[PDB]
Design a protein around this ligand. Sequence first.
Ligand SMILES: CCCCCCOc1ccc(C[C@H](CC)C(=O)O)cc1CNC(=O)c1ccc(C(F)(F)F)cc1
Ligand SMILES: CCCCCCOc1ccc(C[C@H](CC)C(=O)O)cc1CNC(=O)c1ccc(C(F)(F)F)cc1
Ligand SMILES: CCCCCCCO[C@@H]1O[C@H](CO)[C@@H](O)[C@H](O)[C@H]1O
Ligand SMILES: CCCCCCCO[C@@H]1O[C@H](CO)[C@@H](O)[C@H](O)[C@H]1O
Lengths: 258, 258
Amino acid sequence: QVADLKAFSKHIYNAYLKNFNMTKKKARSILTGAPFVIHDIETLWQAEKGLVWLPPYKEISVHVFYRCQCTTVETVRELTEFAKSIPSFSSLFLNDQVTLLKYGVHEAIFAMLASIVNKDGLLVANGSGFVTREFLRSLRKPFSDIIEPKFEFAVKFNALELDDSDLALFIAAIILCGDRPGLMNVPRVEAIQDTILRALEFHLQANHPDAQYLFPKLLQKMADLRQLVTEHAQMMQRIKKTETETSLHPLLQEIYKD
Amino acid sequence: DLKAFSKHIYNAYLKNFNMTKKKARSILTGKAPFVIHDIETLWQAEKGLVWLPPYKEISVHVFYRCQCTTVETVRELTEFAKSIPSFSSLFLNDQVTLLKYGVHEAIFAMLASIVNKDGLLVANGSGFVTREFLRSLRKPFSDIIEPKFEFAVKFNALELDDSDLALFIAAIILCGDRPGLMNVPRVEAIQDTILRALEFHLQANHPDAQYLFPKLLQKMADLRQLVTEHAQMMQRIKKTETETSLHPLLQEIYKDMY
Ligand SMILES: CCCCCCOc1ccc(C[C@H](CC)C(=O)O)cc1CNC(=O)c1ccc(C(F)(F)F)cc1
Ligand SMILES: CCCCCCOc1ccc(C[C@H](CC)C(=O)O)cc1CNC(=O)c1ccc(C(F)(F)F)cc1
Ligand SMILES: CCCCCCCO[C@@H]1O[C@H](CO)[C@@H](O)[C@H](O)[C@H]1O
Ligand SMILES: CCCCCCCO[C@@H]1O[C@H](CO)[C@@H](O)[C@H](O)[C@H]1O
């Protein structure tokens, strides 16, 4: 058990290093010293005009909302490849894999957004841009509702000071979740998750030897993320109800379908 | 390119399907399987001569063995599909949608390879269960059997070989009008490529065949009707035979078929 955990953790980290475009290590070097700062309409237009970088244009709040969907779609592709590299995730039947991804990606996305964020804003477009928290909060309701809860979570999450190797096991535990609706092989997914959680506590003891209560704090963060996604899906429902001209990407339609 | 397309599909077929039609026709012709034709021969077959939920009765036992072969063939069809150009490029939920509505059409076409008018090869060709015995099972279980033999005899009269079947099965899976497909234009495009490859392949492989390609297009329509009728019998069995188990994968496949 103790010898198999270190190899397991290393395999998952490699799956992480191989599949995600931005690491917290890379992100943290960009945010400590250059990204083009986007803080109003004019700089946002600048960024789109090649300094940094879709359905037909409409308005600024809707354009940003569309760029949020695009990052989700791309992060889902990365999370799908990550999960496939996970031990025995690929042994599940394909429909169980889709179930885990469907109900797990947004929990993992919000955890991973914390890596590319500080209290003042968000790295965008491979870290070549930085969009400020203040500009994001200046958008129109209902679109601005979805913004600040994610910053409030990320600031508290970044306080735990996790690194990419911790995060790789954290995300894997989010995905391999046994109580997802419609899951076929519940005992098999619970088994995989228990191994990942075991590997995670072992990894934390070695990587953060002085850290107080870090494993149960992380388990609590997993419950916070489910609550965060719950509130986020509620706000997406309001956007769908009250902003009928605004489009939702087909993949997000499938994720949010009941 | 188009020959290369067919050769790639053919190799993914030989790589992923343990029993080929060539092999099956060698066994069934005589280049010798234990014949299962009644209760006693079936018992001998289970007692190591040839080879699950707890036993209930004979007709349910065979019904369970039918489910086991579907589960195993879905696994092979999943890997065959994942080896097809641009099937893997679809999103995973679209891949599952195609398999969900495609596997039984492919399964019934592929079962024709291991069948003659008298019965069916079982357990890697080591057994042969007679159409006679299968028809003699209790209703409602026996109802699922004879429409399949009817289809297969006529299907075998076209005298396809494994090279033809590989493209036929690929065309069945990559099917653009499956319910709930996300990227219909991309699936329709892949299907059109397979079908053009098949037309081209049948020209070379069956030069003297008359109307073979449109006959095969008609067999694909016949397969879809055979599966609709089969799905209705399966739902009636779940209604009237509450003690009989249905494998979870089959529960998920038949959940929304009418
Ligand atoms: C740590 C918290 C950061 C909070 C910021 C809000 O970020 C988000 C909130 C919610 C979602 C979930 C989506 C909603 C459609 C889903 O439902 O899938 C995604 C993002 C990700 N946003 C971006 O990456 C982003 C934002 C702006 C721009 C730009 F440059 F245009 F301004 C470019 C990219
Ligand atoms: C012309 C083609 C063949 C026709 C014969 C009927 O065969 C079938 C009909 C319907 C299905 C679809 C399933 C049903 C649950 C689904 O709904 O998925 C599968 C089979 C495949 N049967 C077997 O392989 C089989 C049968 C008997 C035994 C044995 F030895 F125990 F008696 C062992 C294996
Ligand atoms: C192994 C490939 C064949 C799998 C076929 C079974 C697919 O079932 C479907 O899986 C989906 C989750 O992914 C659910 O949303 C659907 O409710 C369910 O019907
Ligand atoms: C790309 C991996 C992430 C996919 C997440 C979205 C999955 O959507 C679900 O796909 C299933 C078909 O497979 C359908 O049965 C469900 O109705 C649908 O909600």
